[PDB]
């Protein structure tokens, strides 16, 4: 039995029945504090080595550091039950062994809820949505995967993906398989290009992109490999490290959107 996940605004996330109109961006004004929640259902009798949530958001949403709260069945986790790392554009939250004990080997489905807020800022452009992207990276083996980090192309409209490969221990290995990625508009959600990295190559470039738009390369699941998207350092460059973790593909919830008008 697979875990299930949903992401939405406060009070609206529901993995069993995601919100029917979530495709429509919710209208906000610059300065609004927007409240989010990620709800995950973990099956009875789980034995995960890793339960990790990774969240990043587009530049018009300023992640509000210090606002992350996490509960299991509506009981707040103790500090030692999880490890949270917050960065400018989002966060990563992983259960420790103490936290895993509260969701593994249970006799009924367990519900994890993570809440936080972000602020709509003056980088937002009227009529153009802002969004976020989350993964639940899990498995019976340790998992090293996480969520895509959106990036703009360089000034010439070029965006280059560089890929490396390591085994479960983090040691370099040859490419495991041909790797396909969907380049998605990170704000609006549509696929703009699909690229393929053959096993004799480590880079691929997409040309002719909008230098003012944030995009993300989303790796199509490669059996036995998890995708570790590196932090962004440079417009026009995205790096991914594939780990041979031998785990199931991650969960990737449908995403809510916000927008502002003039």
Author numbering: 187 to 448
Q: Which sentences from the paper describe this structure?
A:
Gram-positive pili differ from those of Gram-negative bacteria by the presence of covalently linked subunits containing a conserved LPXTG motif or a variant of it. In S. pneumoniae, the genes coding for the pilus are contained in a 12 Kb pathogenicity island (the rlrA islet), consisting of seven genes of which rrgA, rrgB, and rrgC encode LPXTG-containing proteins. Only RrgB is strictly necessary for the pilus formation while the other two are ancillary proteins. Here the crystal structure of the RrgBD2–D4 backbone subunit fitted into the EM reconstruction of the S. pneumoniae pilus reveals for the first time the polymeric architecture of a Gram-positive pilus indicating a head-to-tail organization of individual backbone subunits.
A further crystal form designated RrgBD2–D3 (residues 141–592) was also derived via the construct design process. Crystals grown from these constructs belong to the monoclinic (space group C2) crystal form and diffracted to high resolution but lacked any ordered electron density outside regions defining domains D2 and D3. Because of the close packing of the molecules in this crystal form, it seems very likely that crystal growth occurred after a degradation event during the crystallization process. The first 262 residues (184–446) form a dual domain (D2 and D3) made of two β-sandwiches of approximately 100 residues present in all crystal forms. The C-terminal β-sheet of domain D3 contributes one additional strand to domain D2 completing the 4-stranded β-sheet of the β-sandwich. Domains D2 and D3 are oriented together in such a way that the six loops form a flat relatively broad surface of >5000 Å2. The helical component in domain D2, one 3–10 helix and a short 6 residue stretch (aa 283–289), is consistent with that found in the eukaryotic IgG immunoglobulin fold.
